[PDB]
C-alpha cells in the first residue's frame, strides 16, 4: 500500500504541481513584455501631437 501511494503521489505531482524554475522564466517573459507594450503605448500617444505644428 505504501509503495503504490508513493508512486501515485509522484504520478499526481507531474500533472498537478508546477515547476518553480520553469514558471519564473515565463513569469519574467511577460513582465518585460508588460513594460515594453506599456512604453510603446506612451509613444503612440505622443505620436499624434506632431501634426499641430
Amino acid at each position: 500500500l505504501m509503495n503504490a501511494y508513493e508512486n501515485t503521489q509522484a504520478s499526481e505531482s507531474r500533472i498537478r504541481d508546477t515547476d518553480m524554475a520553469e514558471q519564473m522564466t515565463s513569469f519574467t517573459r511577460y513582465q518585460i513584455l508588460t513594460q515594453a507594450a506599456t512604453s510603446m503605448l506612451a509613444q503612440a500617444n505622443m505620436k499624434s501631437q506632431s501634426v499641430m505644428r
Binding site: 498537478r16 514558471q23 519564473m24 505620436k47 501634426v51
Partner: protein, 57 residues
Amino acid sequence: MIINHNVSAIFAHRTLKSNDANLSKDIEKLSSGMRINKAGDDASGLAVSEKMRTQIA
C-alpha cells in the same frame, strides 16, 4: 495624419491587455505552487489528478 482615431494605440493596448492577463496566471501558479489553479487550463489533467488525489488519500 489621422487624428480622430489612433490605431497604433489600439494595437498596443490590446497587446498590453493580453500581456498583463497572462502575467496574472503566472503569479497564480508561482504563489500557489499548483499548476492547475482552475478548470479549463487542463480539463482532463485536473480530472485525472482529482482521481489520483482520491486514491492517494
